[PDB]
């Protein structure tokens, strides 16, 4: 086939897709090229890796996979790479969709192909091969949210000699109830290109299972171990430093001089020396958070949508620093409006204390729930509430007629807003005709907003909090994972505390005589069956 | 246009030769034009559907609301040219209704549309029951209190007492709004009983019952929103506004090849793709 | 074979599909709209038709007259 829609399709591809074993064997025996890649736009439709071996793997035809891999005529190159660099394992990862049956099929085919590849090429590191994006099959599974195949790979255990080296989970010992497992953490914590934790945590927010992928046993235990080891103390220290920063900023802003036209000449008195020191420290922290936000933007390259569907804390800290810097500019521009900026920064700064509720499970999950409430329930409520408020305020201020100070849309909007906070006067003016119209409008507004809509907000919050327990917990765990990875990247003292329980000898030896050290993580377990 | 209405007496108001008044009268003309548009749209809906006079009050709420908005607009026009300031009374109602009718357009957005459907359900069930019982309690205790109140050496009006007792619902009840009575113990006992029954019991009960309702109208609200959007789709397709023919589908596809006769059969089908990893 | 049995309307002008929709007979409605037959000389009666099957991917055509 030369047509662009089916370009590269061959008789072998058709025979494999039709699940005709005899035709496949006859075509291969007759000289069909097993390396003939199909590059039609349809084969990108249904994607299988542009290779007949990957086609057989992706269609659950194990017999055809074995034949194409180790037939007597022309074996297929297991390390063959398609137009995007993907191998057979990348193709298997790509076709996963985390359903039960597809996950079982992908798991079985992946295991069989990897074992056969080891048997035919014991020297080949099949999983280490990256595609053109630079992703291994494990990194691709993590990047694309293929939680099923990811969980399989990370927990892979094999119980035969000369192929158990492929496994990542290995039972170190079995006593009676006590068992010890070693998980291979190669390219989980550090890979020198991209680790699984880096891929999951720094995903683009469109990954399907980004919140759930960290519930895979070794990753959860690893992140908890890293937290308890060295990140808990560093995080609490950072929280303490931020508390000191905001206390100093609060003190400096509270005792701002009230004379006109800044900048204010420093007086030779102790209180003003402390005040100007506090101002310098406040501006220093603002500059710090400003450059930290720039560093985040450059190191992540957000897609200009991930800024506003994800990474809210970075935006908030950056905006706080922006208010601080605008305050500095207005301060040295001889404008009192710097105060307008400063208080906003101050307000934002204190609300940014909620960022540090992560690292405490109950408070962190609570802050995540606050986020969810703001984004869903408060958003919908505020849209409808503002529609009602503006409509009834316009009606009332139209009805109001000054004669002999209301009749301003702002004042009427404020008076109608007061009903929401339980301070609505209900007789705030008499400057109208048709008192029945005025009171009917106010009563309709009150019934629609105060009695209906606000209690409806309470009810919807109840439904939401009922239906986001696990989601909030997973999001908090992801936030703490991001904290752990950022602390590890910073590391502050050239330390190397990110490593696992040592260069342990997991399986002894590869099929070669060389001994293999894996940098494993030990997990103890107790079981009362399968002794 | 309504905000900048002139405040002189006895409409219609002579147009002044100034820019602001030209903009004002243009806005008023456009407002009345839109009112006429929605009026005739409501008539067209009534004639084309022939509602059974019960389907109006269990269904077609949005058409009735837009029609009533236009009715208020037209009554405002009639009063305006009838030299009555009461046109303002109509106009503001239309204005208020118009802004609430903005919620009609929350359909077409799934979350906001389902939210508006839930608002509808809350109004029809929970607010209805609550308002019946609440108005019974409010009127009863207002009558008792205003009977107890005795003016002279203001209150002792049923309206004022009803308003004062309503203020408790919005968190603004004085609880000592008058002293013009004998038997202060009776007055305070009545007010406390009213507060416990309405503010503490009935309003918090409204919150609880709204929680119970929203817990069990998720799928019903989603289905009703889908039906509303379906009605929107059918009305837009029926109108079509420019003789367009975008209503069609993937084309005259040859589905089965042939009937039992020799004729080739074209069906105008819609294509749906799916993936199945079992039952090969 | 020459008779279009489902096109016959009742006194109200409703075909069996229109009647199923009108009366809320969601079960028979869902059956009719998703009706599929897999034999020659009877598949013309179906409304759901499988246009093609590759491997995991299938394509269906729903008749929506
Ligand atoms: C003038 C005065 C204004 C005061 C305004 C103040 C607002 C509240 C301040 C709250 C501060 C807490 C905070 O620092 O931000 C919180 C909450 O944000 C908001 O709700 C802002 C709403 C706007 C989330 O921060 P995070 O960056 O962790 O985002 C999550 C990712 O981590 C994670 O990977 C997940 O992808 C997840 O989906 C992401 O969300
Ligand atoms: C003086 C100032 C007064 C202001 C008063 C303002 C009230 C609220 C205004 C809300 C406006 C939203 C709207 O436009 O109407 C909404 C809500 O209506 C109400 O709750 C009014 C209560 C009275 C529903 O509109 P709809 O026509 O879609 O009805 C549905 C059908 O579509 C669908 O086919 C189904 O059959 C479904 O069972 C039907 O319901
Ligand atoms: C959800 C809560 C709703 C509250 C209602 C506020 C919105 C109403 C519309 C704003 C109109 C702006 C305005 O025109 O109001 C300005 C006053 O400035 C302000 O104070 C703006 C506040 C910004 C509001 C932030 C949203 C001049 O009118 P004035 O009658 O106060 O002039 C007095 C000078 N002798
Ligand atoms: C749920 C909320 C409950 C609020 C209570 C309202 C119902 C009470 C009974 C109405 C009685 C009508 C009346 O008689 O009140 C009128 C006042 O007109 C009005 O303002 C009627 C408003 C219509 C109410 C719409 C529902 C003359 O009495 P007045 O004591 O105010 O005369 C003073 C003139 N110097
Ligand atoms: Na109050």
Quick gist of this model?
Chain A: It is a multi-pass membrane protein. The structure is cut from a larger assembly and holds three copies of chain A. With 531 residues, the first copy, chain A, is mainly α.
What order do the helices and strands of chain A follow? HHHHHHHHEEHHHHHHHHHHEEE
Question: Quick one: how many beta strands of chain A?
Answer: 5
Q: The biggest beta sheet of chain A, please?
A: 3 strands, antiparallel
Structural class of chain A: mainly alpha
Strand content of chain A: 5-15%
Strand line-up across the major sheet of chain A: 1-2-5
Which two chains form the greatest contact, residue counts included?
Answer: A-B, 53 and 50 residues
Number of helices of chain A: 18
Q: What general form of chain A does the structure show?
A: elongated
Report the oligomer. Answer: part of a larger assembly
Q: How far is the N terminus from the C terminus of chain A?
A: 58 Å
The small molecules bound here are: the ligand CCCCCCCCCCCCC(=O)O[C@@H](COC(=O)CCC)COP(=O)(O)O[C@H]1[C@H](O)[C@@H](O)[C@@H](O)[C@@H](O)[C@@H]1O, the ligand CCCCCCCCCCCCC(=O)O[C@H](COC(=O)CCCCCC)COP(=O)(O)OCCN, sodium ion
């Amino acid at each position: 086939y030369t047509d662009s829609y089916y370009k590269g399709q061959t008789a072998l591809h058709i025979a494999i897709e039709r699940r005709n074993m005899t035709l496949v064997t006859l075509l291969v025996e007759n000289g069909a090229d097993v390396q003939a890649a199909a590059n039609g736009d349809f084969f990108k439709g249904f994607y299988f890796g542009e290779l007949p071996l990957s086609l057989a793997a992706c269609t659950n035809q194990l017999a055809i996979v074995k034949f194409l891999l180790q037939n007597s005529w022309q074996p297929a190159d297991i390390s063959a790479r398609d137009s995007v660099g993907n191998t057979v394992l990348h193709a298997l990862v790509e076709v996963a969709d985390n359903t039960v049956d597809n996950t079982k099929f992908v798991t079985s085919m992946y295991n069989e192909i990897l074992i056969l590849g080891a048997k035919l090429h014991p020297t080949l590191k099949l999983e280490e091969i990256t595609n053109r994006k630079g992703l291994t099959p494990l990194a691709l599974a993590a990047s694309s949210g293929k939680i099923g195949v990811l969980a399989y790979i990370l927990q892979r255990e094999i119980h035969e000699p000369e192929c158990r080296h492929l496994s990542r989970k290995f039972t170190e010992w079995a006593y009676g109830p006590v068992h010890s497992s070693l998980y291979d953490l190669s390219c989980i914590d550090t890979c020198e290109k991209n680790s699984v934790l880096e891929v999951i945590a720094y995903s683009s927010s469109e990954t399907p299972n980004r919140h759930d992928m960290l519930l895979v046993e070794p990753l959860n235990r690893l992140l908890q171990d890293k937290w308890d080891r060295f990140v808990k103390r560093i995080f609490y220290f950072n929280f303490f430093v931020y508390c000191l920063y905001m206390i100093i900023f609060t003190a400096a802003a509270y005792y701002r001089p009230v004379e006109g036209l800044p900048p204010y000449k420093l007086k030779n008195t102790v209180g003003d020396y402390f005040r100007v020191t506090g101002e310098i420290l406040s501006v220093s922290g603002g500059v710090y958070f400003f450059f930290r936000g720039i560093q985040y933007f450059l190191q992540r390259r957000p897609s200009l949508k991930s800024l506003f569907v994800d990474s809210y804390s970075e935006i908030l800290f950056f905006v706080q620093s922006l208010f601080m810097l605008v305050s500095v500019v207005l301060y040295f521009s001889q404008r009192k409006e710097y105060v307008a900026s400063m208080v906003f920064s101050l307000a934002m700064g204190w609300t940014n204390m909620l960022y540090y509720t992560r690292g405490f499970q109950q408070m962190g999950i609570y802050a995540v729930m606050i986020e969810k409430m703001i984004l869903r329930d408060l958003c919908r409520f505020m849209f409808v509430y503002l529609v009602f408020l503006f409509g009834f305020s316009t009606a009332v201020v139209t009805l109001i007629e000054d004669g002999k100070s209301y009749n301003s849309l702002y004042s009427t909007c404020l008076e109608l807003f007061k009903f929401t906070i339980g301070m609505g006067d209900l007789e705030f003016t008499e400057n109208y005709d048709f008192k029945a119209v005025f009171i009917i409008l106010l009563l309709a507004y009150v019934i629609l907003t105060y009695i209906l809509l606000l209690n409806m907000l309470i009810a919807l919050m109840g439904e939401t909090v009922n239906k986001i327990a696990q989601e909030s917990k997973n999001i908090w765990k992801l936030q703490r994972a991001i904290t752990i990875l950022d602390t590890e990247k910073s590391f502050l003292k050239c330390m190397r505390k990110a490593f696992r329980s040592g260069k342990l000898l997991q399986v002894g030896f590869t099929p070669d005589g060389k001994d293999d050290y894996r940098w494993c993580f030990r997990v103890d377990e107790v079981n009362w069956t399968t002794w």
